[PDB]
Design a protein around this nucleic acid. Structure first.
Lengths: 97, 100
RNA sequence: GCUGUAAGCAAGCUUUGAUCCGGAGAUUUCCGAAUGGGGAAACCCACCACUCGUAAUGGAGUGGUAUCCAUAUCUGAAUUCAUAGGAUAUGAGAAGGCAGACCCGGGGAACUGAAACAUCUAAGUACCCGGAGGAAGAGAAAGCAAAUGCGAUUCCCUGAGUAGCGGCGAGCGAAACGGGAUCAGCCCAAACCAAGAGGCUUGCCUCUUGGGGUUGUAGGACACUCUGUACGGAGUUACAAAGGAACGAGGUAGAUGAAGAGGUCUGGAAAGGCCCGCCAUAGGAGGUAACAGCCCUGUAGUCAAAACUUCGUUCUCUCCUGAGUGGAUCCUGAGUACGGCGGAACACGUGAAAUUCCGUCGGAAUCCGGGAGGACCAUCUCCCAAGGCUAAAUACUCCCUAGUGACCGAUAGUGAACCAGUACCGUGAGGGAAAGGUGAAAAGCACCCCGGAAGGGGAGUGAAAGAGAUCCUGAAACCGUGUGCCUACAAGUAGUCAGAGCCCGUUAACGGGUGAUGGCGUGCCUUUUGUAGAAUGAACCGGCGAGUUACGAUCUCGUGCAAGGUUA
RNA sequence: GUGGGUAGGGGUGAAAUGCCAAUCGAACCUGGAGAUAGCUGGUUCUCUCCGAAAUAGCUUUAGGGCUAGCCUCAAGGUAAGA
RNA sequence: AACAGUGGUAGGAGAGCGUUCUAAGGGCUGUGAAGCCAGACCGGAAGGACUGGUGGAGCGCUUAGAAGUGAGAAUGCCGGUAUGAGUAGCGAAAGAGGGGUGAGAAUCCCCUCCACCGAAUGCCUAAGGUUUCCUGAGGAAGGCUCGUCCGCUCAGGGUUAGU
RNA sequence: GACUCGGUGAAAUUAUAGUACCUGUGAAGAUGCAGGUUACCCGCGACAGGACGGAAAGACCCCGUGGAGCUUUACUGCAGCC
């Protein structure tokens, strides 16, 4: 409230909107993938039972905040344009589902 | 559980251990008269009848669970059992198996 | 042993088995839906049959006699048929109530908020009215949903205070996906065929009965191949209704039931201390002259119901075919669906508004069809509305058993522990109290003295009588009676510090009480710039009386685990 | 006098805001209702540590509130502070 | 241990005391529990303890937990008791005297004088009231004072219709 | 009626008060405050100047974003009527 002065949520404009569909390919930090030593076959089903991905909201991207140094036959739905370099220079395949 | 008139000891109380028979029972109040036990002097109005009034020498009756029967044989204070062929639940006195 | 409260007297009754407790009946004046009629509730008056009685009238008993509806049957007006209507009998029809609740439907506000208020909210809340059932409502797709799809509704948790709605403000606020509890699906209608009837111009087409027939990438008819009429299945709760009779287990009454007076002491009384013994599938509770496993009722375990029930199984009984193949064509829900106008319910306030439901106008297709996929159109995916049945999962309690409370202990807990919705208060709808405890039992005070009598003093009763009728405990305000010290030259919010005299000896302390008089000193609280306040509050005394609780959000503090934590 | 009707955003009034059960510019009862109150009264045991303000911007707002202003608790920064 | 501080409303922080109940055992009670009253005792307070007397069956301590957790003020609520105060008031309106009753008489009864209403304070009977009527006893309570008396209390009795 | 005796016997109020006067200071008009002066202790019968005496959370004024009743070419609307 503001006494009777027209308060701050009314002196300020709307900013619409929210999507009819917004998808959150989330989350894979890249240094989560050093949970495989050595390991391959990085799939969300092999990540669901290992708790790196808590709940998979319509797919996952792989986000390049990290490094390896490990090869991984990565089977993921989406990738950053940096995760096609760390997985790639390590020699592991970076298969987009 | 005791009836008029079985042979009766006094478990506890002021008269702890005397015996006597039963003048009357009062089963709704759970309380039994014994001769000469809880002998209490009572003052009475001059009646109609008798004209004497005076002091009487009655007994106020006794609660039932300060009263036991006796074995006829040992003369012991004994607890009560039952189940008697052709006896209509006649009391087995413990230290088996005397009736009544 | 019994004749309830009730504590006493008379009269009686009972192991030729009484008092009590259950089952099954019978009895059940009158009012009350009241129902023959009137009625101002608890009363009057009838009539029709039948009985009792008088010579008869009068009088008395026994049933029947409302209203609506339905099944029939006679009659049957203006008016001819015929009908309205009238008369009669049959209906173990239904009107009333109440568990102040929960669930549908019709109506349906305001106050409050939005800091005003009128859109909104409050709120489809309360309240009124109709429904019944122990539950109701909904329900087997014109459903979600957009894949490798799910498969009737309901309820719970998430989803999430998200998508949204809103003078977009107050506030309102879903669904679907995910996981459980519960878990069953089916009949009608329509064509086709059989039997009646009923008319038309034979023909033709129009109502009932009996089969058949229950649908979606379509099903049925129809036709053609099979398949049964059983021994297979079902069944009274849907699925179609409907009967019995046996086996077992609960319930409305029970019955059995272990172990010590252990001794001593204190005592009015052991159930308590000490020293001891046992039982225990029983140490649940409650009495017991005081705190009992063993004294009693019982408890734990077992076992029983003549009669009523409630439930589960069987037998009896009852009832019943399912499929392929094609589509020459006939069906698949009409004044209905949708559409205009006007409203309401959907979280959606008339909107880009899907959807449902009403009023009023219009008004289609009927498989080559049609509907949903949040205005609208094509493609694509589901799915057949315009008919109906559906237990359980759910919400509930005036209730009835058994039980549990970090619930209450009489100014509390229901208003009512007490003859409470009583007394009183109101014309009346209505408001609505206060009031617990002798003792272990009446042993409730025989007798004497005073007194008219209550009321006492002795005497006994019991542990207490100071316990004796408000009857355990008894405080304070108050009201007394004795008093030790002060007071009749004194001006005082009454106290404090000083202080001699006088009087007492202590939770043994630089004691206690009164303090002649002196120095200081204008109550407590609220509200105020400021109150001794001539500003408010309080007569006093005692009791009751106000910051939480439920659910979330935030910060510190603590604990576990740590890019892994919690599970509804 | 008897007998009897007219019922509360109504009745009734040879009218005054009168009367409607001792109540009238809207009768009493029960509920929504624990309506709301920026307004008044009340806010129950002790000790210590610190310790305000009655100013401003606004405000259907002036005896209300909301940010600042001054207070307090805790943690960092560090000697900024005067 | 050294040095400094230590008034205080609104308010923030910290530490405590209380009461009731539950949970561990441990410990007091008929050789007397709780509560009550007394008292010159101890800690910083809220507060505790001890001896006496009453009281006649329950109760504390520690350690945690729960909270219908604390009274002086609400023109609060209920109950009791004051103050005013032996004060206002004792509800229009003539009795007096003798006797009797009884414990007690102005107030009760009887008698005799006197006085008031007499188009009402007469009788009769509606509205209502539901025994208030009569007798025989009492008398605490209601009678605005007594009170042998009553419309009070008890115990009986009491209302007869073809007009 | 009042006064007195005998019977019976309340209420409003009320922080505790053993309650003098005047001049001053004070919340600006004292019994209780300072200074001064009077005043043996306790009753009864009266009067009413004071205790801002009781009685009624002021009727007057003003505030409440309080309410009611009423009025109209105040707003938006309802019935009624056309």
């Amino acid at each position: 409230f503001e006494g009777g002065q027209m308060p701050l949520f009314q002196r300020l404009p709307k900013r619409g909107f929210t999507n009819i569909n917004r998808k959150e390919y989330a989350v894979v930090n890249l240094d989560k993938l050093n949970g495989f030593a050595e390991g391959t076959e990085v799939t969300p089903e092999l990540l669901l039972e290992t708790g790196v991905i808590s709940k998979l909201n319509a797919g996952v991207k792989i986000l390049g905040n990290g490094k390896l140094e490990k090869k991984l036959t990565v089977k993921a739905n989406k990738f950053s344009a940096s995760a096609k370099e760390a997985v790639e220079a390590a020699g592991g395949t970076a298969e987009v589902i | 559980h005791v009836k008029k008139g079985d042979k009766v000891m006094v478990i506890s109380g002021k008269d702890k251990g005397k015996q006597g028979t039963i003048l009357a029972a009062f089963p709704k109040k759970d309380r039994v008269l014994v001769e000469g036990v809880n002998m209490v002097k009572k003052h009475s109005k001059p009646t109609q009848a008798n004209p004497q009034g005076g002091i009487s020498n009655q007994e106020a009756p006794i609660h039932v669970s300060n009263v036991m029967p006796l074995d006829p044989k040992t003369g012991e204070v004994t607890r009560v059992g039952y189940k008697v062929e052709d006896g209509k639940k006649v009391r087995v006195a413990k230290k088996s198996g005397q009736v009544l």
